[PDB]
Design a protein around this nucleic acid. Structure first.
Lengths: 49, 129, 129, 129
RNA sequence: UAAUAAUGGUAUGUACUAUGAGUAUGUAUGUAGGUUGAAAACCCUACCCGCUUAGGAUUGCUUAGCAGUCCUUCCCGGCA
């Protein structure tokens, strides 16, 4: 009975702790990206001769 | 020019505000979040319940704002409970001002505070044409 | 323009509006009047309840189910009850927008929507310097 | 200066400091807020509870110094309780200042700590001429 | 297939209270079956969903950068 009472006393903290803090940690990070392009010109010289 | 207040009780769930000048008035905010699968899919439901109470004694008999005539105090309590999915918070916000104006039209600008009711009052929804 | 909402059930106490296009959304505004005697003078007490409920289907998971199927609809509810005497609506109007401005900082501007408070918030009372 | 303490158990109505070097020494503050009704006036009362403890082995026998005298360690606790209406804090302070001087002339300068009481000790009230 | 139960739970509405979401109550306990009883159906079967175990998928392919998944097992949970 004492063990069960201690159980009932602690798991309020268990609920206040574990699921909430784990989901708080989980609610972080995700994939995203950005991109762009150009038609930049690269020139190589050739002598007129 | 509005006097601010400062917290009284600090908790992971509840924050109690109150004016140092007038301890009668207070504003507190407690919120509970629940881990829910409505359509066999997980949802982030957060239920933020807000209370704002002011003890304002204002019977003030006609034209008697004259002298040291104290009146007993009366309650003015405002209860708001907002619950919804955190993922849809952006549109949940959008619904929120619709609730503002809807109440404002029928009550703030309307005459529902006296206890009357107008079914013909303009009531509008969140979505647009 | 936002789509007008029309009543479905009218009563001396409760009026329930709904959108003709989609009647799932509702706005039920109930009233509840009682007689309160405090300062050897009966006062007119109104307990004005307002419930605004909107329904928006799913958080819409990407791909997979985006062909012809929708995950069951969720519920978004905002409940507001306004109490106090009817002899002093003028101050009740003033505090209501103050409550509106108070809730906005936590919800509309702050991150209280996602479920996280802010003890360093800046809220003010209805009264003014 | 002296050694500052850091709080080790914070709560909305319970804050306890203790010295990091000597964790035995403590200072606890408890505030109990309650609303009390007096004649035609609702009153907001607060009780200030303050406990200061210093654990200390008191007397060195005569005037030596040595290792094999580790005498029992005893306690020195000073508890102070303040109660009064919130808005009367302005005058609440002054009599507290009076309470300081009032016990000063009896204990700090008098032999009240020994166990003796002086009927002709100078005692004054908060009010002044 | 299954009964005794401790059925201390949860969610959703009701009346009171409320400077409280506290009190009590109805309803249901992911989806359907067997079953007396304590019909708030205790429990087992089957099907879905989310955990956990440690294994894998062409592991490379790509004139573009892929891809934020998939299958099995351990696996506990979505009324006790």
């Amino acid at each position: 009975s004492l063990w069960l009472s201690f159980r009932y006393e602690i798991m309020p903290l268990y609920y206040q702790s574990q699921d909430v803090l784990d989901v708080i940690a989980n609610s972080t990070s995700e994939f995203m990206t950005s991109r762009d392009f150009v038609a930049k010109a690269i020139n190589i010289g050739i002598p007129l001769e | 020019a509005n006097k601010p207040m400062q917290p009284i009780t600090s908790t992971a769930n509840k924050i109690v505000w109150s004016d140092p000048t007038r301890l009668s008035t207070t504003f507190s905010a407690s919120l509970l979040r629940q881990r829910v699968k409505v359509g066999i899919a997980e949802l982030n439901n957060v239920s933020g319940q807000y209370v704002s109470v002011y003890k304002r004694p204002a019977p003030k008999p006609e034209g008697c704002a004259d002298a040291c005539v104290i009146m007993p105090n009366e309650n003015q309590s405002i209860r708001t409970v907002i619950s919804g999915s955190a993922e849809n918070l952006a549109t949940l916000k959008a619904e929120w001002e619709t609730h503002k104006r809807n109440v404002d039209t029928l009550f703030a600008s309307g005459n529902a505070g006296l206890g009357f009711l107008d079914p013909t009052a303009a009531i509008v929804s969140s979505d647009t044409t």
